Amino acid sequence: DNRIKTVVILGGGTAGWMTAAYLGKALQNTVKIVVLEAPTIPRIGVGEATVPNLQRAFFDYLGIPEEEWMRECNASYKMAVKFINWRTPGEGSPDPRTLDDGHTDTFHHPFGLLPSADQIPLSHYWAAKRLQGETDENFDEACFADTAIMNAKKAPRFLDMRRATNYAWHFDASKVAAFLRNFAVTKQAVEHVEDEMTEVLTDERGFITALRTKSGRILQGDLFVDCSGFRGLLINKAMEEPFIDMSDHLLCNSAVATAVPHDDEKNGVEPYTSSIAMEAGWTWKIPMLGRFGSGHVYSDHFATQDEATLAFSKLWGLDPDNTEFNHVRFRVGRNRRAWVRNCVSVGLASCFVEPLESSGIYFIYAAIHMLAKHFPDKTFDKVLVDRFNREIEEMFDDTRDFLQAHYYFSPRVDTPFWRANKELKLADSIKDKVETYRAGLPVNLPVTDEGNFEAEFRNFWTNGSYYCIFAGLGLMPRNPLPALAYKPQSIAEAELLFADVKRKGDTLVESLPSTYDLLRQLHG
Amino acid sequence: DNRIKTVVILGGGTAGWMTAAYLGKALQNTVKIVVLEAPTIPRIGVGEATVPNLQRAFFDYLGIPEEEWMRECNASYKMAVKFINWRTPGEGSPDPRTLDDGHTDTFHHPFGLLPSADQIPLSHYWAAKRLQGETDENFDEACFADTAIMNAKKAPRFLDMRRATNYAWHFDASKVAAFLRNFAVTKQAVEHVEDEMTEVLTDERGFITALRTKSGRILQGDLFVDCSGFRGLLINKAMEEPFIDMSDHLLCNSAVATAVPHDDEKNGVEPYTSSIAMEAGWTWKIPMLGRFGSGHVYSDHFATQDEATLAFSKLWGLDPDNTEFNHVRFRVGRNRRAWVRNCVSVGLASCFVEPLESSGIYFIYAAIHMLAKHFPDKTFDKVLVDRFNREIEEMFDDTRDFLQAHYYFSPRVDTPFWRANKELKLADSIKDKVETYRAGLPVNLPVTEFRNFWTNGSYYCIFAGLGLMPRNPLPALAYKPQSIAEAELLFADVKRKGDTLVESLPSTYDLLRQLHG
Ligand SMILES: Cc1cc2nc3c(=O)[nH]c(=O)nc-3n(C[C@H](O)[C@H](O)[C@H](O)COP(=O)(O)OP(=O)(O)OC[C@H]3O[C@@H](n4cnc5c(N)ncnc54)[C@H](O)[C@@H]3O)c2cc1C
Ligand SMILES: Cc1cc2nc3c(=O)[nH]c(=O)nc-3n(C[C@H](O)[C@H](O)[C@H](O)COP(=O)(O)OP(=O)(O)OC[C@H]3O[C@@H](n4cnc5c(N)ncnc54)[C@H](O)[C@@H]3O)c2cc1C
Ligand SMILES: [K+]
């Protein structure tokens, strides 16, 4: 028996409890699992929006039904990230300014795939018509019925729970953690130790043999998962793995966050995350029943904590002194290696980018999934460790590049922040994709239809997502896809798809309940 | 109007007529298409086995139904490539020698997809049991019902045309070409010019403007497709694009081929291609109704034409002097760039490897598909041309590496040929895949494509078939007793499906005889 017998998980945030719950299922009770978390060292407390594979790839693997976890964490529905004032200069406002060309400064990044005609995605037929003056429709409204549904604040499900569109989730991060702790302890025999780690004990090769707690107790193990957060107490401190800082790709390094009570009866509930541009970064809005989570993300090199806090307060008309604020400074980048010896980093201890496209919790279940697949025995085959590390580095660097694109192609130059973005160098892979887009070619054409996690993880950002961000920001191909000049029957087939999107939007904008009404049913 | 108005295709083999037919459909009669071919300069004449995406990716785009084209080219069913005598030393025989362990030296590469349990393919559950002494079944027999069906020479369809398994096609290459000529001329307004090209006319920028024919005809065009074959009359000669020779990856560079009449009533028809190992390469067998195509592929550095011809003749017991033989010397590698200025190479003019896994016709429809997607206007955007060239180079290098693996992991050391294979440099991508396999991890896990066409199941078929095993089972299996048990049901389902189907299916012979009237 050369097997791992005990797994010790340091940290009890979303990362630790997601790791405990998942490994509990994957390892089928052949391994002891221990979570060491100090209740006195708080979880980061933010991490409130997600992507659509969360239910398929995570809660379904654990056999937890969507309605059960949503009810426990005051969850709401997310059909997109909505970008506001990313093209026009001035102070932060929740209200979109007007472009030179008369359009409102909003674009959507919704989920689910573009239809295609003659093997060409709808994006490319839209771009031809728009470059040729045959349409003044935005990419988002022409190519996704989700846009019309979001504009009307309608739910992605009917009241009897049949599905209308693709969606993701908004939720309370701390309640998701608590719900997962309860699951892991009562249903998967996970041992919960509430104490502080004071020592990391190693053998002659620098492999971890145990953690000591403040109370003197020693937890032995064969595999340690560092979910300690930004501190990286195992991967960075004990194991001395360097963190590769990547503020030369993205500038934000700070956030100030609160929860804002909300008249849902008056305003309705937005089924989307808003990314509201600011002078020195942007501000998230994550609606739930009764309130929305908000946070101004910023570079402390271009705003002081006090400056960011005031602009954030002004945005929502908050009193800066009778308002509770959570202040965070964050690393941007990844460990040189996520997994060193018998230490695997997961969550903020591994890697991080601004929450601009809700990538954090996805990084956690992607890592856990890859750990389950690459799960070692005590020989720790170096090839297993290398393949795991390679998956983590490509997943991160892909998403980092996609995020950089959101900033580098903002036309805003009104503040030193917005100008500073244009001074940063693009990575090669994102330059290559821009040149592809600019020639009218598709970028990362999606592989399957909606339907299987591994079948999405490869290249997570598809053609539709590049179009949402490039075209949303006003970067267009130089010319239409030249093949369209030879394909009049395919132009016409695409006109039926544009009409199908309009009809589905109009029909569903009429029949669907408000997000408010679906939430009110869901939460009793 | 900046558009291409006339496309001229040089060559009337499978490449030219596939190009004409496909572009005919893709370009929706916005473009004049001309095929210039000399009846007096023959087709390569071979190119008789395929892979399963042929119907999806080609005949379906043309709206031609499977039965219609099969009937016109004497087509038969291919459920695998069957490797014979690739592990044991000696002369070429069609009969499998006996391995050290007592079983026959045969393994299959079938197209059936592997089921999985707890997101792990059946390959890995097989490998665990085999490395731990818990099974004596080979990978192919344990993991695919297709193996039992092929051993019984049964068809991959019932007589009522319901599908049993995945499969590809065998066919007469010249009849496929003729059927496609007829389609292109009568249904897609393609002009067929029967003449020999003598000059390629270029403008001051080195772009082609027209081809001049022996009879003094000038064919003007905006875009030229070189389907001239190994000659590469446009891409290599006129356009001066260098061919990157890759005999440092694969040694074979020659073939001697014939067609052999066959008693189908007596022997039945094998629903597979056979790759029969020889002293200085291998010999294909491609069955159809009434005959099989065969050819000994070889390195001329390790056998003379006469040596290869004798061994090939001995194999089938042919009289070397009252037997018609097609002798070919072939390029191995690709053009530095497949598309230069307004010249696009397709087929043997583009790139080539030995027909070990029936990759030739796939290179044609993959290229044509990519040309339709990257179709230029007269500005010939440099980025469109570069992205096309990149897709061709990844498609080719993927398949080249997969082929190299068939040779580098043969245990045979009995001839200088088989030893010389161990001396060749492995490409980085195939070294990386071997290291992945050896750690028990999957290689290119399937999804439900042209640049990772060869999946986990195909790597297992070749590695495990040749006797290369992972070092140890996938370690995660040691923690998953419920998944081991779920996999036992799938092994039992393969056995049961094989037994059931081996009983209910018609013979390949009988399905062919129904199909061809
Ligand atoms: C501003 C911000 C916004 C974000 N927004 C999103 C979003 O919208 N969507 C999204 O998907 N992700 C988001 N993320 C990322 C997401 O929040 C994280 O991936 C997720 O919250 C998990 O964090 P964690 O568990 O790794 O770390 P933490 O929550 O910091 O957990 C650290 C744990 O380690 C324990 N610990 C520390 N030291 C010791 C010790 N010595 N002994 C014992 N225990 C110890 C603590 O007690 C705690 O339990 C955001 C992150 C930030 C910073
Ligand atoms: C030994 C061997 C085995 C193969 N086996 C397989 C297989 O099993 N499966 C598979 O999928 N593929 C296979 N292939 C590849 C496959 O045969 C080819 O991709 C395809 O069938 C034919 O290629 P082609 O049409 O480019 O060239 P060719 O058939 O050589 O055609 C060349 C054309 O150019 C014309 N031409 C040349 N010069 C002139 C001129 N000056 N004027 C006018 N016309 C001219 C000729 O008339 C002819 O029409 C094999 C290839 C070889 C060599
Ligand atoms: K290469």
Side-chain angles (χ1 to χ4, degrees):
Chain A
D1 204 329
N2 227 345
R3 284 185 292 170
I4 302 296
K5 307 309 308 196
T6 304
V7 167
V8 175
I9 297 167
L10 177 55
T14 301
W17 289 117
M18 284 187 65
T19 307
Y22 197 100
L23 287 190
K25 182 61 185 196
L27 297 184
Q28 293 185 13
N29 256 295
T30 63
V31 172
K32 186 176 164 53
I33 304 164
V34 179
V35 179
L36 173 54
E37 65 95 21
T40 65
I41 307 188
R43 19 272 132 218
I44 205 80
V46 299
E48 351 201 47
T50 63
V51 294
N53 63 12
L54 178 63
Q55 180 67 26
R56 159 209 328 243
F58 188 74
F59 290 113
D60 277 1
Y61 189 74
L62 305 185
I64 301 177
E66 190 169 321
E67 285 82 358
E68 203 194 317
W69 74 256
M70 286 191 70
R71 255 199 229 74
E72 294 297 340
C73 330
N74 197 24
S76 182
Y77 296 91
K78 175 186 172 195
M79 297 171 58
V81 176
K82 192 185 182 173
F83 295 87
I84 304 171
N85 290 337
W86 277 73
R87 300 173 71 176
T88 59
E91 294 186 58
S93 163
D95 295 303
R97 293 185 271 280
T98 295
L99 292 160
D100 291 342
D101 74 3
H103 279 110
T104 301
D105 194 8
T106 75
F107 64 95
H108 295 82
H109 182 191
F111 299 122
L113 305 183
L114 289 175
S116 74
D118 188 25
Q119 303 197 56
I120 299 167
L122 195 59
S123 55
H124 285 51
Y125 293 96
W126 170 83
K129 286 177 74 208
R130 179 79 190 229
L131 288 167
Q132 291 170 171
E134 294 183 49
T135 194
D136 291 283
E137 278 182 299
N138 297 311
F139 170 67
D140 60 355
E141 54 190 340
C143 295
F144 306 87
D146 310 65
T147 306
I149 298 172
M150 279 182 284
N151 285 343
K153 295 187 184 151
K154 292 310 182 91
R157 276 182 196 283
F158 295 92
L159 280 185
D160 65 0
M161 294 310 281
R162 58 203 146 87
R163 170 194 294 282
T165 59
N166 206 9
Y167 64 95
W169 298 269
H170 296 153
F171 51 66
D172 194 318
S174 78
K175 296 194 180 194
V176 164
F179 172 88
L180 286 178
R181 169 211 295 128
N182 198 97
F183 178 79
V185 168
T186 66
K187 297 259 145 67
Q188 299 275 167
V190 169
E191 197 204 332
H192 183 200
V193 184
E194 303 179 64
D195 210 350
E196 276 187 46
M197 187 276 274
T198 57
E199 313 174 346
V200 177
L201 313 182
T202 61
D203 69 18
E204 295 92 346
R205 293 170 307 152
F207 282 63
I208 301 169
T209 56
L211 310 185
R212 181 198 296 288
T213 67
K214 187 168 180 156
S215 85
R217 205 198 149 165
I218 288 184
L219 316 170
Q220 318 246 274
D222 311 312
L223 184 69
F224 297 79
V225 187
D226 191 350
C227 304
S228 54
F230 289 132
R231 294 166 217 69
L233 293 186
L234 308 188
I235 188 61
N236 301 122
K237 272 187 57 66
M239 295 287 97
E240 289 179 357
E241 195 66 4
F243 184 77
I244 309 183
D245 172 70
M246 286 169 165
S247 55
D248 52 337
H249 295 253
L250 296 169
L251 288 192
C252 295
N253 60 19
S254 325
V256 42
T258 182
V260 176
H262 190 264
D263 201 347
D264 293 346
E265 197 156 21
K266 174 187 287 291
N267 292 316
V269 177
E270 297 158 315
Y272 53 79
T273 300
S274 310
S275 169
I276 303 170
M278 308 282 289
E279 302 208 69
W282 62 280
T283 296
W284 78 70
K285 177 183 184 193
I286 297 173
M288 301 171 274
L289 206 61
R291 51 172 217 280
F292 63 88
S294 186
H296 176 19
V297 169
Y298 70 96
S299 177
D300 64 9
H301 295 357
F302 293 93
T304 71
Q305 193 184 114
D306 321 43
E307 287 180 321
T309 310
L310 256 44
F312 175 57
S313 303
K314 180 157 282 170
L315 188 77
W316 299 122
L318 295 178
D319 175 18
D321 294 306
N322 280 37
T323 296
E324 196 181 308
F325 297 115
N326 168 22
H327 300 269
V328 185
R329 172 77 216 279
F330 49 83
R331 316 198 286 191
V332 180
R334 57 170 183 82
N335 299 323
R336 179 187 51 183
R337 292 164 311 168
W339 177 356
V340 176
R341 288 185 287 273
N342 66 332
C343 185
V344 189
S345 47
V346 167
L348 302 187
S350 183
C351 66
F352 190 67
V353 290
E354 18 190 317
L356 192 46
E357 289 282 7
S358 312
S359 65
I361 293 158
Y362 160 79
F363 285 169
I364 295 169
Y365 57 85
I368 290 162
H369 178 93
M370 282 326 261
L371 178 53
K373 185 169 161 186
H374 292 91
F375 206 76
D377 69 18
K378 277 155 143 155
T379 70
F380 279 86
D381 177 353
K382 248 166 216 138
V383 175
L384 288 180
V385 173
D386 177 79
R387 293 315 185 259
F388 169 96
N389 277 334
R390 178 201 286 180
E391 298 291 349
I392 297 293
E393 85 168 49
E394 292 174 0
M395 173 197 69
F396 185 77
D397 288 0
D398 187 50
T399 284
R400 179 205 50 197
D401 288 1
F402 180 60
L403 284 214
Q404 193 183 3
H406 293 57
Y407 282 111
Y408 192 84
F409 295 117
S410 182
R412 282 182 67 152
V413 296
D414 51 316
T415 76
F417 177 68
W418 287 113
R419 290 193 294 279
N421 281 307
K422 318 303 207 294
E423 293 314 318
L424 304 178
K425 304 217 138 170
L426 279 187
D428 283 3
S429 89
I430 189 71
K431 271 179 181 177
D432 178 84
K433 282 185 182 75
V434 160
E435 192 186 55
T436 300
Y437 174 79
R438 288 286 274 158
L441 288 163
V443 182
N444 282 355
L445 206 51
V447 272
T448 178
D449 51 358
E450 264 141 77
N452 207 328
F453 164 70
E454 272 281 26
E456 162 170 278
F457 171 71
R458 296 328 306 178
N459 297 265
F460 180 61
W461 301 117
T462 68
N463 181 76
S465 281
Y466 279 102
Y467 263 78
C468 285
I469 306 297
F470 292 158
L473 285 176
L475 181 81
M476 293 291 292
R478 284 181 325 251
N479 46 258
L481 177 64
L484 294 183
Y486 308 84
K487 294 177 166 292
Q489 297 179 351
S490 315
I491 307 300
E493 184 189 339
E495 284 308 314
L496 180 66
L497 300 168
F498 284 130
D500 291 337
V501 161
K502 280 290 161 287
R503 161 160 9 89
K504 174 179 178 170
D506 294 343
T507 303
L508 289 174
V509 165
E510 281 308 303
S511 47
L512 280 162
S514 68
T515 302
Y516 180 53
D517 285 351
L518 187 59
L519 284 182
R520 269 181 45 258
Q521 179 172 291
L522 181 61
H523 299 305
Chain B
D1 205 325
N2 225 343
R3 294 180 297 175
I4 302 299
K5 306 307 299 182
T6 306
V7 169
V8 178
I9 297 164
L10 178 52
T14 298
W17 288 115
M18 283 185 69
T19 307
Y22 194 96
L23 288 191
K25 193 78 168 69
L27 298 183
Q28 293 179 20
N29 211 50
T30 63
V31 173
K32 181 55 153 53
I33 303 164
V34 178
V35 182
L36 171 58
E37 65 95 15
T40 63
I41 305 183
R43 293 91 256 149
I44 205 79
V46 300
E48 347 199 44
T50 64
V51 293
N53 65 8
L54 175 66
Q55 183 67 24
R56 294 297 101 171
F58 189 73
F59 287 115
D60 275 4
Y61 193 77
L62 303 188
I64 298 176
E66 190 174 322
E67 55 274 13
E68 202 198 312
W69 73 255
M70 287 189 70
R71 253 199 227 73
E72 300 311 334
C73 61
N74 194 24
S76 183
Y77 297 85
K78 176 182 171 199
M79 296 176 56
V81 176
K82 191 183 183 175
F83 293 87
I84 299 169
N85 291 339
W86 276 75
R87 304 178 66 177
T88 58
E91 295 208 327
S93 162
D95 292 304
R97 290 190 271 283
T98 301
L99 293 160
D100 221 311
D101 66 30
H103 204 35
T104 50
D105 193 11
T106 75
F107 65 94
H108 297 86
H109 179 197
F111 299 124
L113 250 198
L114 288 180
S116 73
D118 186 26
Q119 303 195 55
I120 299 167
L122 196 60
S123 57
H124 283 54
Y125 292 100
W126 173 80
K129 286 175 76 176
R130 182 73 174 227
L131 288 164
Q132 291 170 164
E134 298 189 34
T135 181
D136 309 332
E137 274 185 304
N138 294 308
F139 171 65
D140 62 354
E141 303 160 17
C143 293
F144 304 96
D146 310 62
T147 302
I149 295 171
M150 280 183 286
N151 288 339
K153 296 186 177 162
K154 293 309 184 91
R157 271 184 203 281
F158 294 85
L159 288 171
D160 74 2
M161 293 314 287
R162 289 175 305 106
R163 171 195 293 281
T165 62
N166 199 18
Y167 63 88
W169 299 268
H170 296 152
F171 53 66
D172 193 317
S174 78
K175 294 212 218 288
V176 152
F179 166 89
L180 285 176
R181 168 207 292 132
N182 194 261
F183 178 79
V185 169
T186 64
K187 301 260 200 73
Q188 299 277 161
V190 169
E191 200 193 337
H192 185 191
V193 182
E194 304 179 63
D195 208 352
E196 172 168 11
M197 189 273 273
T198 56
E199 198 175 0
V200 173
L201 294 169
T202 61
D203 66 21
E204 68 280 354
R205 297 173 302 146
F207 281 61
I208 301 177
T209 52
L211 310 187
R212 186 166 64 77
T213 72
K214 188 128 89 197
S215 86
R217 261 204 88 162
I218 283 267
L219 302 171
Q220 305 196 275
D222 309 310
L223 183 70
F224 297 79
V225 184
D226 191 350
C227 303
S228 53
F230 293 127
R231 291 172 216 69
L233 292 188
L234 308 188
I235 188 59
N236 301 121
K237 179 147 211 206
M239 295 287 97
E240 288 166 27
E241 192 68 4
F243 185 79
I244 308 188
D245 171 71
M246 287 173 161
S247 54
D248 53 333
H249 296 256
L250 296 170
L251 287 191
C252 295
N253 59 20
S254 325
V256 43
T258 183
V260 176
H262 188 265
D263 201 346
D264 295 343
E265 194 174 328
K266 172 189 284 201
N267 292 315
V269 179
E270 296 160 313
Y272 52 80
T273 300
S274 310
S275 172
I276 301 162
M278 309 283 291
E279 292 189 61
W282 63 279
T283 296
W284 79 71
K285 178 186 183 191
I286 297 171
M288 300 166 283
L289 210 61
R291 48 154 174 175
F292 64 87
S294 187
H296 176 18
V297 169
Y298 68 96
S299 178
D300 67 8
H301 291 301
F302 291 95
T304 70
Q305 193 183 113
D306 298 321
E307 285 181 320
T309 317
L310 174 49
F312 178 57
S313 303
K314 180 161 202 157
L315 192 77
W316 299 119
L318 294 179
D319 177 17
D321 296 304
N322 280 237
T323 294
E324 275 180 318
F325 294 118
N326 169 21
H327 298 269
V328 184
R329 173 78 160 77
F330 51 81
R331 311 201 291 189
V332 175
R334 55 177 185 79
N335 299 323
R336 178 187 49 180
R337 291 165 313 168
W339 175 358
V340 180
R341 288 184 287 278
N342 69 331
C343 186
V344 188
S345 48
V346 170
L348 302 187
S350 180
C351 69
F352 191 66
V353 289
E354 21 186 315
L356 193 45
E357 290 280 4
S358 313
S359 62
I361 291 160
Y362 159 78
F363 288 166
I364 295 166
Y365 61 82
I368 290 163
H369 179 271
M370 284 300 100
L371 177 52
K373 182 189 215 171
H374 292 91
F375 206 78
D377 65 26
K378 278 154 144 157
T379 70
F380 283 88
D381 183 343
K382 197 191 176 189
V383 174
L384 290 182
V385 174
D386 175 80
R387 295 317 187 253
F388 169 94
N389 280 332
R390 177 200 287 181
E391 296 292 330
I392 296 295
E393 87 174 42
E394 292 184 9
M395 171 198 72
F396 184 80
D397 291 1
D398 189 50
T399 282
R400 178 198 58 189
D401 291 1
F402 180 59
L403 285 213
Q404 202 184 356
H406 291 61
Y407 280 112
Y408 191 86
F409 297 111
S410 184
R412 283 178 66 151
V413 300
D414 50 317
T415 77
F417 176 68
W418 288 113
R419 290 192 293 281
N421 280 309
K422 318 297 148 54
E423 286 282 331
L424 300 183
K425 306 165 154 188
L426 273 189
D428 286 357
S429 97
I430 187 63
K431 268 182 254 157
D432 177 87
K433 283 185 177 65
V434 161
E435 197 187 45
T436 297
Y437 174 77
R438 286 285 295 170
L441 287 167
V443 183
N444 283 2
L445 206 50
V447 195
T448 75
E449 161 169 275
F450 293 138
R451 48 187 191 269
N452 296 293
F453 177 62
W454 300 118
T455 66
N456 179 77
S458 284
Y459 278 100
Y460 261 77
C461 286
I462 305 298
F463 290 158
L466 285 175
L468 180 82
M469 293 291 290
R471 273 198 295 286
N472 45 258
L474 177 65
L477 290 183
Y479 307 87
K480 295 175 163 294
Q482 298 167 35
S483 315
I484 306 297
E486 184 186 329
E488 283 306 310
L489 308 188
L490 297 164
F491 284 127
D493 288 337
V494 163
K495 190 70 205 173
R496 169 176 318 110
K497 172 186 193 220
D499 293 344
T500 302
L501 289 175
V502 164
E503 259 52 57
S504 47
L505 283 163
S507 69
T508 301
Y509 183 53
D510 281 1
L511 190 61
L512 286 184
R513 270 179 41 177
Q514 177 182 261
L515 182 60
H516 300 310

